[PDB]
Amino acid sequence: FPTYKCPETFDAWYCLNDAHCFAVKIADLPVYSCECAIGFMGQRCEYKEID
Amino acid sequence: HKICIGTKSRLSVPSNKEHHYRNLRDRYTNCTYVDGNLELTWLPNENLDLSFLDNIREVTGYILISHVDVKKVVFPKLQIIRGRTLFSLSVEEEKYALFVTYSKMYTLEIPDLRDVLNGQVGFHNNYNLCHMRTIQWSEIVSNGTAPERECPKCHESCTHGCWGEGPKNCQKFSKLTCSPQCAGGRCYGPKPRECCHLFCAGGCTGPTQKDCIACKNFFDEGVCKEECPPMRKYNPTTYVLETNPEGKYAYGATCVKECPGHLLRDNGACVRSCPQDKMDKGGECVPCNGPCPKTCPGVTVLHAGNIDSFRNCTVIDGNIRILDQTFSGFQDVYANYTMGPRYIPLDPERLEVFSTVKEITGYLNIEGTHPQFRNLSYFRNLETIHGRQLMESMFAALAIVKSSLYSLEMRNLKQISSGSVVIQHNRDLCYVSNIRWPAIQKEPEQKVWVNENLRADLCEKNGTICSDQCNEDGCWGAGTDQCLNCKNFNFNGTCIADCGYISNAYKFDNRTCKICHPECRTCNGAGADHC
Amino acid sequence: HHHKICIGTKSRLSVPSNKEHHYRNLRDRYTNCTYVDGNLELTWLPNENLDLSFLDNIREVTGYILISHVDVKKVVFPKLQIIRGRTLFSLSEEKYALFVTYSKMYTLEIPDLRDVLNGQVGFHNNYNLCHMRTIQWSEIVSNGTDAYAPERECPKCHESCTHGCWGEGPKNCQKFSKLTCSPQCAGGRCYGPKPRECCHLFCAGGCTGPTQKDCIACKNFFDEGVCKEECPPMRKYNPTTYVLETNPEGKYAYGATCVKECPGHLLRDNGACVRSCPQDKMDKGGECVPCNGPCPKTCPGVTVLHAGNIDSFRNCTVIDGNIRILDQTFSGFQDVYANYTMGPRYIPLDPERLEVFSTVKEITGYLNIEGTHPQFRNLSYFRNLETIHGRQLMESMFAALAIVKSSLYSLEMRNLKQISSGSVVIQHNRDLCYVSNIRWPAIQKEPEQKVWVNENLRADLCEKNGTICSDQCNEDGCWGAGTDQCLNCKNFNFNGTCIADCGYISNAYKFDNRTCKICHCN
């Protein structure tokens, strides 16, 4: 399930709160999404998880 | 008939996928009707149970299925997808009510699915998936292959295509199937004049409005209506609006006789907020005589970029969320997913802007962490949180989660109109467990969660425990003003043991002292000569 | 739009003194009309020479059709297809959408009348009338009902004709959107005899295809050709955000019609189109609006002014209705009830009592004055009247202001800045003066509005007689002799009056060449 590095600008600045950026191409389009750090969720990992 | 709230994180996931699975199971099991988008992503291991899907009947937003490798995905009871929120890959391009991609299931069985009300259907780059090419999506969508593995014929049983192997699995038709006299609707037999009322959604069992499966717009009295019974009903014969004794307020897909009361009433509707022509009056969304009080829209996250807007606001329409990134500062992203402008870190001293604030129509959410973000005295003049819009599945009007706060300090907060209090995992926060929140909340049905804050004993030893001058109701901080309710006497919003302590105080009530008229030093009473 | 909208008439079975004026009236009212909002009544046309081509473009009538005492050999509605019968005609108990009495016409031709949505058809005493018995009204009359002999021998219905005819020839064959139909679409109307060939349940009296988009006319609501249960709301409530959003696709409801803009005679109020504003609401720019502060007072109009109802206008700022001032008004007049039964007679009143209208600023209907009394001169009683909206007009010449055979020496209503949507008719006032010299378009809102000013006192005799406009005042005219009475001033206007130069009236600062103002100058 192949995943690639984001453009520098996205890699550095897209994901917040110590998340990691990953990129997929779907239908020849780059989709930049993120792997959230423990306790965060949201698209840019911006929201704190509630128990 | 349980509700559940859909997520909206798209292809993003928790690092821990087992956690992720358990997150979905929690959210969706026993769910009938999902409000929002249901995103079923990153089940990378076959043999995950997937039972939570079993009860879902309606999804208001889009359904997105991505990176799921369970062999067979079944939505046993899903019949309609409203697609009121749609999924996109770039701002230009199709918006999807259903999109499955990069996924390893052998079959996606959504039998019994009748209607996708808005948005398109998409499948991209997912092998082993079958029978989707055999499905007529023209039948399911209003307007808008090469699987490499075998691919079992549909059962002999059924005339068109199928969702999967069963005779249970062939696609049925309620729409394309019936007479042309039914344009705009589904239809319950194939004869012309066997069609269902244009008011409902996803089929119907007969011609009348009591008869469809779901209500397209409003459900009232067990009958679908397109519009709630009007307060003023028009008469076409004599050209006049009459007053309607049968009139009812529109309250999100139901018609109610009186509004919830934490809501406003626009002409025919229970509303969250007045539109630009009009303004709040007691209850009603009345029009502005002359000027319209300028107002302050809530912000999605509070940051150094938007803080200025809140200067001099008495009422915040919307909500206030101060999150970690508020203090740390962050880059913004435009809706194109091009990087926008960077935001300098916010300094808690700048939150003073809210001191003018008296009411919050949405919810207050404080999760931000910072060495100097100690109290919440910026909101010292805030007196009510309306809770017209709540936060998370907890349904919180006031959520304080993992903030750096030590005390609340919100002296004037008298009311939370609707929704719950949730205050958890604030490590040196005090007072919060001794605050009798019910006092503050408008209705006893409203709930409170207070857990994992600085332990009560540990506050006591520090002596951050609240005046003697206040009752069992608790308090927002240590000081005499802080107390929610004075124990004995109240003088100038200060809690005092006995009026006599202050010479300039005279005993106005049984629970009050007022200051003595400039004129004289010590009064018996409340006068210019009286003293 | 709507193509051409007419207003129907309420005056029913009432005989007219002058047959030519009456024909002229009907011709004026109905020509080029496609949709009659009201009742269409053809009464007392006795001349067989009369030309009835004003009926030529009528396609729909919202109320009833009354045809009585019509004597022309053939009466033909070439394009009428629907009678709504929202209001029905019945005598002093059965209720009619179509009622035809005491007429001598040989043939009544409504070749394309597909549907009568409400009320019953009725014929009575039409001795030459023919073919009506060959109709089979059960098809035409919604509800699915049978409805109501000639002196002559009656022409064989055309051979083309499957069942019945409205007259001679094949174009007069009766069409059967309803009875022809396959049982398979019971409770509707098919465009063909086969079982799949029927019509949308919204369709009224026919259609071209199965969709609600192919309806001829509709039972429910007709929005720019399509048919819908309801008209797109102006404000639509959002279930997700709980907010009553404004609707870009919104239209107003005019009857069973759906319009972007509301017709002139109606006010828009809450996405509907009403003739009157509510109690808590103010008329403003054709829209009911909330009135800032308390609402201004209003009283209803009266069909004829007299002692009984004159007091009712005390302190009125707006008159919602019409005002007719008749010889009867002064004379006091013998009342009557519809039954034709005599009513009470009201002591007469004198003109001085007309000072009630002093507070009046607007009349929503028309102002009519045909009263005569030796002391009834000037119309200064209406000296504070500003505007006459022609929301309803008089039956002849579409008159918003009609002063006819009155005993007036002058108008004297300054502040009358606007008659919107009417025509002005001032004729045969023996001693009325000034009216000839007022240029009425100055007061009128649209150049298309007409003025008729004929038969008053000679303008030459008024010169000799002395009574003319002040030497201040442009060519627009004046309402009377005075210095305040002027429509517009040349030479500078100050207060309610006009002076030449702000040098006069001791102090006045000239903050315009055309205006001066008072000092506690420059």
Short mmCIF file of N, CA and C in Angstrom, two decimals, chain C residues 220-302:
data_model
loop_
_atom_site.label_atom_id
_atom_site.label_comp_id
_atom_site.label_asym_id
_atom_site.label_seq_id
_atom_site.Cartn_x
_atom_site.Cartn_y
_atom_site.Cartn_z
N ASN C 220 -52.24 22.30 -8.76
CA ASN C 220 -51.57 22.74 -7.56
C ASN C 220 -50.97 24.14 -7.65
N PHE C 221 -49.84 24.30 -8.33
CA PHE C 221 -49.13 25.59 -8.28
C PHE C 221 -48.30 25.61 -9.52
N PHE C 222 -48.38 26.69 -10.28
CA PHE C 222 -47.75 26.71 -11.58
C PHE C 222 -46.60 27.64 -11.51
N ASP C 223 -45.40 27.07 -11.53
CA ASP C 223 -44.20 27.86 -11.43
C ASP C 223 -43.47 27.87 -12.74
N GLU C 224 -43.76 28.87 -13.56
CA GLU C 224 -43.02 29.06 -14.79
C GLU C 224 -43.08 27.80 -15.64
N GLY C 225 -44.28 27.25 -15.80
CA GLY C 225 -44.47 26.03 -16.57
C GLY C 225 -44.39 24.68 -15.87
N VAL C 226 -43.82 24.62 -14.68
CA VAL C 226 -43.65 23.34 -13.99
C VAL C 226 -44.65 23.33 -12.89
N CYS C 227 -45.01 22.16 -12.41
CA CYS C 227 -46.01 22.12 -11.38
C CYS C 227 -45.65 21.55 -10.05
N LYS C 228 -45.82 22.32 -8.99
CA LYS C 228 -45.32 21.85 -7.72
C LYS C 228 -46.26 22.09 -6.57
N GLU C 229 -46.23 21.14 -5.63
CA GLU C 229 -47.05 21.17 -4.42
C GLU C 229 -46.99 22.53 -3.83
N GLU C 230 -45.78 23.06 -3.79
CA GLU C 230 -45.53 24.35 -3.23
C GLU C 230 -44.54 25.18 -4.01
N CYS C 231 -44.68 26.47 -3.80
CA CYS C 231 -43.87 27.45 -4.43
C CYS C 231 -42.54 27.61 -3.68
N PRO C 232 -41.39 27.61 -4.38
CA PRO C 232 -40.07 27.71 -3.71
C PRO C 232 -40.05 28.83 -2.68
N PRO C 233 -39.80 28.50 -1.39
CA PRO C 233 -39.90 29.52 -0.36
C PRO C 233 -38.83 30.57 -0.55
N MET C 234 -39.15 31.80 -0.14
CA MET C 234 -38.23 32.91 -0.13
C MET C 234 -37.19 32.72 0.95
N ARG C 235 -37.60 32.13 2.07
CA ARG C 235 -36.64 31.74 3.08
C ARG C 235 -36.75 30.24 3.27
N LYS C 236 -35.64 29.52 3.14
CA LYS C 236 -35.66 28.08 3.38
C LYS C 236 -34.83 27.66 4.60
N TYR C 237 -35.47 26.87 5.45
CA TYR C 237 -34.90 26.46 6.72
C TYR C 237 -33.88 25.35 6.55
N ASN C 238 -32.71 25.53 7.13
CA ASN C 238 -31.65 24.57 7.00
C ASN C 238 -31.59 23.64 8.22
N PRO C 239 -31.99 22.36 8.05
CA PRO C 239 -31.96 21.38 9.15
C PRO C 239 -30.60 21.19 9.78
N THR C 240 -29.53 21.38 9.01
CA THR C 240 -28.17 21.14 9.52
C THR C 240 -27.69 22.27 10.43
N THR C 241 -27.87 23.50 9.98
CA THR C 241 -27.32 24.63 10.67
C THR C 241 -28.32 25.31 11.57
N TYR C 242 -29.57 24.85 11.55
CA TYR C 242 -30.70 25.44 12.31
C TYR C 242 -30.87 26.92 12.08
N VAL C 243 -30.89 27.30 10.83
CA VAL C 243 -30.95 28.69 10.53
C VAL C 243 -31.88 28.88 9.34
N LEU C 244 -32.72 29.89 9.41
CA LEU C 244 -33.68 30.09 8.36
C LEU C 244 -33.03 30.90 7.23
N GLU C 245 -32.30 30.21 6.36
CA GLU C 245 -31.56 30.87 5.29
C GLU C 245 -32.47 31.54 4.31
N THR C 246 -31.90 32.52 3.63
CA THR C 246 -32.56 33.22 2.55
C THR C 246 -32.42 32.37 1.29
N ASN C 247 -33.47 32.31 0.48
CA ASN C 247 -33.46 31.39 -0.65
C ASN C 247 -33.32 32.11 -1.98
N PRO C 248 -32.15 31.94 -2.64
CA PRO C 248 -31.90 32.57 -3.95
C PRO C 248 -32.93 32.12 -5.00
N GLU C 249 -33.30 30.85 -4.98
CA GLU C 249 -34.34 30.32 -5.85
C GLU C 249 -35.76 30.70 -5.46
N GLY C 250 -35.92 31.56 -4.46
CA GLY C 250 -37.23 31.89 -3.91
C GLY C 250 -38.19 32.64 -4.83
N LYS C 251 -39.45 32.23 -4.82
CA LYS C 251 -40.49 32.98 -5.52
C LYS C 251 -41.67 33.31 -4.62
N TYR C 252 -42.45 34.29 -5.03
CA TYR C 252 -43.64 34.69 -4.31
C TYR C 252 -44.83 33.92 -4.84
N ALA C 253 -45.79 33.63 -3.97
CA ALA C 253 -47.01 32.96 -4.41
C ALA C 253 -48.16 33.92 -4.74
N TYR C 254 -48.51 34.02 -6.02
CA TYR C 254 -49.64 34.83 -6.47
C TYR C 254 -50.72 33.85 -6.87
N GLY C 255 -51.69 33.61 -5.98
CA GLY C 255 -52.78 32.68 -6.25
C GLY C 255 -52.23 31.26 -6.34
N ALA C 256 -52.54 30.55 -7.42
CA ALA C 256 -51.88 29.27 -7.65
C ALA C 256 -50.75 29.43 -8.67
N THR C 257 -50.18 30.63 -8.69
CA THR C 257 -49.09 31.01 -9.56
C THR C 257 -47.89 31.36 -8.69
N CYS C 258 -46.71 31.25 -9.29
CA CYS C 258 -45.46 31.43 -8.63
C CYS C 258 -44.64 32.45 -9.36
N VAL C 259 -44.48 33.62 -8.76
CA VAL C 259 -43.88 34.74 -9.48
C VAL C 259 -42.65 35.32 -8.78
N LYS C 260 -41.71 35.81 -9.59
CA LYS C 260 -40.53 36.46 -9.07
C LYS C 260 -40.92 37.82 -8.48
N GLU C 261 -41.63 38.62 -9.25
CA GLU C 261 -42.15 39.88 -8.74
C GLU C 261 -43.66 39.86 -8.58
N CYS C 262 -44.14 40.56 -7.58
CA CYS C 262 -45.54 40.49 -7.33
C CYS C 262 -46.36 41.51 -8.18
N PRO C 263 -47.56 41.13 -8.70
CA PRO C 263 -48.32 42.13 -9.48
C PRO C 263 -48.65 43.40 -8.69
N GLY C 264 -48.69 44.52 -9.42
CA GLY C 264 -48.92 45.88 -8.90
C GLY C 264 -50.00 46.02 -7.85
N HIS C 265 -51.13 45.35 -8.04
CA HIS C 265 -52.23 45.46 -7.10
C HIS C 265 -52.04 44.70 -5.78
N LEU C 266 -50.98 43.89 -5.70
CA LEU C 266 -50.72 43.14 -4.47
C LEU C 266 -49.45 43.58 -3.78
N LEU C 267 -49.37 43.27 -2.50
CA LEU C 267 -48.19 43.56 -1.71
C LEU C 267 -47.52 42.25 -1.38
N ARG C 268 -46.19 42.23 -1.39
CA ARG C 268 -45.51 41.02 -0.97
C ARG C 268 -45.23 41.03 0.52
N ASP C 269 -45.61 39.93 1.16
CA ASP C 269 -45.55 39.78 2.59
C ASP C 269 -45.28 38.32 2.86
N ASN C 270 -44.07 38.02 3.35
CA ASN C 270 -43.68 36.66 3.76
C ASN C 270 -43.71 35.64 2.63
N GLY C 271 -43.10 35.98 1.51
CA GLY C 271 -43.10 35.06 0.38
C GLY C 271 -44.44 34.78 -0.29
N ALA C 272 -45.47 35.48 0.17
CA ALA C 272 -46.78 35.47 -0.47
C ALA C 272 -47.12 36.85 -0.98
N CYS C 273 -48.24 36.93 -1.68
CA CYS C 273 -48.69 38.13 -2.37
C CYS C 273 -50.10 38.48 -2.02
N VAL C 274 -50.20 39.41 -1.09
CA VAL C 274 -51.43 39.68 -0.37
C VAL C 274 -51.96 41.05 -0.77
N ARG C 275 -53.27 41.25 -0.66
CA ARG C 275 -53.76 42.57 -1.01
C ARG C 275 -53.56 43.57 0.11
N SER C 276 -53.56 43.09 1.35
CA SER C 276 -53.38 43.94 2.51
C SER C 276 -52.22 43.51 3.39
N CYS C 277 -51.51 44.50 3.93
CA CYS C 277 -50.54 44.27 5.00
C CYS C 277 -51.25 43.86 6.29
N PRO C 278 -50.55 43.12 7.14
CA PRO C 278 -51.04 42.75 8.46
C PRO C 278 -51.13 43.95 9.41
N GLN C 279 -51.77 43.74 10.55
CA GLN C 279 -51.90 44.79 11.55
C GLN C 279 -50.54 45.28 12.05
N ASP C 280 -49.63 44.36 12.31
CA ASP C 280 -48.32 44.73 12.81
C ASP C 280 -47.33 45.06 11.70
N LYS C 281 -47.83 45.31 10.49
CA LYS C 281 -46.92 45.57 9.38
C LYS C 281 -47.31 46.76 8.49
N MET C 282 -46.29 47.33 7.87
CA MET C 282 -46.32 48.61 7.17
C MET C 282 -46.13 48.37 5.69
N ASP C 283 -46.90 49.06 4.86
CA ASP C 283 -46.68 49.00 3.43
C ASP C 283 -45.53 49.92 3.04
N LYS C 284 -44.56 49.41 2.30
CA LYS C 284 -43.42 50.24 1.93
C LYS C 284 -42.73 49.72 0.69
N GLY C 285 -42.92 50.42 -0.41
CA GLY C 285 -42.28 50.04 -1.67
C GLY C 285 -42.83 48.74 -2.22
N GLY C 286 -44.11 48.50 -1.96
CA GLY C 286 -44.78 47.32 -2.46
C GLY C 286 -44.58 46.10 -1.58
N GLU C 287 -43.93 46.29 -0.44
CA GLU C 287 -43.68 45.21 0.49
C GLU C 287 -44.17 45.51 1.91
N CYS C 288 -44.85 44.55 2.52
CA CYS C 288 -45.15 44.67 3.93
C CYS C 288 -43.87 44.55 4.71
N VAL C 289 -43.62 45.57 5.52
CA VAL C 289 -42.40 45.74 6.28
C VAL C 289 -42.82 46.00 7.73
N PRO C 290 -41.94 45.70 8.72
CA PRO C 290 -42.26 46.16 10.08
C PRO C 290 -42.18 47.68 10.17
N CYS C 291 -43.22 48.26 10.75
CA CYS C 291 -43.34 49.70 10.88
C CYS C 291 -42.59 50.16 12.15
N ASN C 292 -41.60 51.04 11.99
CA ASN C 292 -40.76 51.43 13.13
C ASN C 292 -41.45 52.32 14.19
N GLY C 293 -41.59 51.76 15.40
CA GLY C 293 -42.48 52.33 16.41
C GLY C 293 -43.84 51.64 16.33
N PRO C 294 -44.92 52.35 16.76
CA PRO C 294 -46.29 51.85 16.51
C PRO C 294 -46.68 51.96 15.03
N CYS C 295 -47.66 51.16 14.61
CA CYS C 295 -48.11 51.19 13.22
C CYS C 295 -49.05 52.34 13.00
N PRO C 296 -49.04 52.93 11.81
CA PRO C 296 -49.92 54.04 11.47
C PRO C 296 -51.34 53.58 11.35
N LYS C 297 -52.31 54.41 11.70
CA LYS C 297 -53.71 54.03 11.64
C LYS C 297 -54.30 53.92 10.26
N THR C 298 -55.23 52.99 10.09
CA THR C 298 -55.91 52.80 8.83
C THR C 298 -57.38 52.45 9.01
N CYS C 299 -58.21 52.83 8.06
CA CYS C 299 -59.61 52.48 8.10
C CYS C 299 -59.98 51.94 6.74
N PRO C 300 -60.99 51.08 6.68
CA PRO C 300 -61.33 50.50 5.40
C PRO C 300 -62.12 51.49 4.55
N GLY C 301 -62.01 51.33 3.24
CA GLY C 301 -62.79 52.13 2.31
C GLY C 301 -64.24 51.74 2.38
N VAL C 302 -65.07 52.55 1.74
CA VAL C 302 -66.51 52.32 1.71
C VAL C 302 -67.00 52.44 0.26
#
